[PDB]
Structure 1
Amino acid sequence: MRHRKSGRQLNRNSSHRQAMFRNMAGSLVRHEIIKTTLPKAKELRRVVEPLITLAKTDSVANRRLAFARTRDNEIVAKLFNELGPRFASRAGGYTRILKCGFRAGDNAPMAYIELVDRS
C-alpha cells in the first residue's frame, strides 16, 4: 500500500530519477519555462522551489550546497544573482504549471512549467 507516502517513482530507480531531475531543474532555471509531462513536472515544483528559497539568502555554505545539488556553477550563480532578489518578497509558489493538450508521440498529459515572473 501507499498510506501517507510521497515521491513519485516515474518507473525509474533513485539514481536515474535524481539525475534526470537535476538536469530538469538546471534547464528550468536557465530558460524560465520548459514543457514536460504533468506528473514529471509536479515533482519539479517540489524540487526547485526549496532551491529558490535556499538561494534567497547569499552565503558560502548555501552556495556550496546549491552547487552540490545542481552540479553547475553557472546555474548556481544565475540562481543566486537573479532569482533570489526577484522572489525575495514572495512567500512560496515560485512556479506555475499550465496544461497544454497531449503529446502526439505517446498521448501523455503535458504542461508548461514556468516561473511566476517570466515576463
Structure 2
Amino acid sequence: MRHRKSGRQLNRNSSHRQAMFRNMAGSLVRHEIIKTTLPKAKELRRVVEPLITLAKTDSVANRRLAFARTRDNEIVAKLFNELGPRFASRAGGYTRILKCGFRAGDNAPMAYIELVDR
C-alpha cells in the first residue's frame, strides 16, 4: 500500500535521484527551456520553484543556502540578479509544461518545460 504518500522512485536510489535533479535544475536555469520525459518534468517543478521563491530576498545567508542546494556560482548569480526581480510580483507558477510526441529509441512520452516569461 502507498496511502497518502508523495514522491517518485524512478527505478533509482536516493543518492542518484538527488544528483540527477541537481544537474537538471542547473540546466533549466541556464537555458530557460529543456526537453525531457513527462514524469521527470512533473518532478522537477518541486525542486526548481522553491529556489526562485528563496531568491526574492537577497542576503548572505540566502546566497549560501542556494549554494548548498546547487553548487554553482553562475547559477546562484543568475538566480539572485535576474530571476527574482523578474518574478517579484507573481504568486507561484513560474514554469510551464507542454506535451510533445514519443521518443524514437524506446517510445517514451516527452515534454518541454520552460519559464513562463521566456
Shorter-chain TM-score above 0.5: yes
Query: What is the rounded CA distance, in whole Å, between the counterparts of 2:106 and 2:83 in structure 1?
Result: 34
Query: What is the rounded CA distance, in whole Å, between the counterparts of 1:34 and 1:90 in structure 2?
Result: 22
Structure 1 unaligned blocks of 5 or more = none
Query: What does residue 8 of structure 1 align with?
Result: 8
Structure 1 residue 85 displacement after superposition: 0.4
Query: What is the rounded CA distance, in whole Å, between the counterparts of 1:67 and 1:101 in structure 2?
Result: 36
Runs of 4+ in 1 over 4 A off after TM superposition: none
Please give the per-residue CA displacement for 1:19-62, whole angstroms capped at 9, x wherever unaligned: 00000000000000100001011111110000100011111111
Query: What does residue 108 of structure 2 align with?
Result: 108
SS of equivalent to 2:34 = strand
Structure 1 residue 98 displacement after superposition: 0.3
Structure 2 unaligned blocks of 5 or more = none
Mapping 1:17-96, distance limit 5 Å: 17-96=17-96
SS of equivalent to 2:10 = coil
SS of equivalent to 1:77 = helix
Query: What is the rounded CA distance, in whole Å, between the counterparts of 1:52 and 1:111 in structure 2?
Result: 22
Query: What is the rounded CA distance, in whole Å, between the counterparts of 2:93 and 2:72 in structure 1?
Result: 24
Please give the per-residue CA displacement for 1:58-96, whole angstroms capped at 9, x wherever unaligned: 111111000000010110111111110001110000110
TM-score by length of 1: 0.97
Question: Paired residues, what number?
Answer: 118
Query: What is the rounded CA distance, in whole Å, between the counterparts of 1:60 and 1:50 in structure 2?
Result: 18
